[PDB]
Design a protein around this ligand. Structure first.
Ligand SMILES: [Mn+2]
Ligand SMILES: [Mn+2]
Ligand SMILES: [O-]
Ligand SMILES: [O-]
Lengths: 205, 205
């Protein structure tokens, strides 16, 4: 069974960018539900229940047909949110190899930001925007609902190893921003953990 | 061009079931945006622009490829929300031919409510739950994002003439209910306009 990971900071630690109320509800209610639902479907599947969630989502085709959608949605939700909490932190700065790779692949940091913002704003309905690594090149992509690029192109419509991501479901920003998703996206640049992003970039897997 | 319709009641008219704050934002911001985006896309297409939105959404395949998705999302959003405001009202009661048809097709009203609630709760991500008339039988179906059953099965995954619907995008309930979608769904029974639903049932088109 999966368990809900504890946050690596307090609930008010991303203030004044991301609000304290949302952080608590997003973690304790939304993420908790995905963990609960994934665990429930997994009770009947002992062969898969032992796996790490990031590994389980790359093997959705191996699952039984009646379990596939529920695990794609819930284990996808667990994997995405787990990555999300680790990818947030105040006071980091984009530097080094990651910064150089971004400038190499996007022209400049500003071009990268514009491309990321455009992907994040254009995802209609629920979803996520991602900065992924693929073919030794960085790229910006987006997925629907709780799909991840780790699931592969056939399922998610995208692929590659996620370096960093932004949750664009309405629950992530509604309490503070309401319909103003672009304000939320602009505010995200203040809280992206560049240290963690650099760490994932260095690791590659 | 499309005009944002004015509400048939005040913003606090659905209190204490649906909150005033949400009614105002949902109408003036969300619906306004769908109207704006649809109008921007229809500017070059006078052939399609003279049509009513409900008619336009049944002819998505006849549009140019670069215009199809934007119109599916935005004219779909305009059509769904327009139907939504008219389908809400306090103090109505389910009766007559519609009540008889519901009992005929579902067994009882209670069975219908359970099936509707189940469809509305199970729609993962953004979407709508609907009570449609498929020829002569009533049925409960759901669609993703701003898709409508008027678009047909090939596009939406559902079909039939919409009698009544419930918006299950997070913006429709987050300010009051947060993650508690089932509370919002239960609260919906107090504000469903049965008179309007009966009128649509009588008309059939
Ligand atoms: Mn989320
Ligand atoms: Mn809506
Ligand atoms: O999410
Ligand atoms: O909506």
């Amino acid at each position: 069974s999966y368990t809900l990971p504890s946050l690596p900071y307090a609930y008010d630690a991303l203030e004044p960018h991301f609000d304290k109320q949302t952080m608590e509800i997003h973690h304790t209610k939304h993420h908790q539900t995905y963990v609960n639902n994934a665990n429930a479907a997994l009770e009947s599947l002992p062969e898969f229940a032992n796996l790490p969630v990031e590994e389980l989502i790359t093997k959705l085709d191996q699952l039984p047909a009646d379990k596939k959608t529920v695990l794609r949605n819930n284990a996808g939700g667990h994997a995405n949110h787990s990555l999300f909490w680790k990818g947030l932190k105040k006071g980091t700065t984009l530097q080094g190899d990651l910064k150089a790779a971004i400038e190499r692949d996007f022209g400049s940091v500003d071009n990268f930001k514009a491309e990321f913002e455009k992907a994040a704003a254009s995802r209609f309905g629920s979803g996520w925007a991602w900065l992924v690594l693929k073919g030794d090149k960085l790229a910006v992509v987006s997925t629907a609902n709780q799909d991840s690029p780790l699931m592969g192109e056939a399922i998610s419509g995208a692929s590659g190893f996620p370096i960093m991501g932004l949750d664009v479901w309405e629950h992530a920003y509604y309490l503070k921003f309401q319909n103003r998703r672009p304000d939320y996206i602009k505010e995200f640049w203040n809280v992206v953990n560049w240290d963690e992003a650099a760490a994932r970039f260095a690791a590659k897997k």
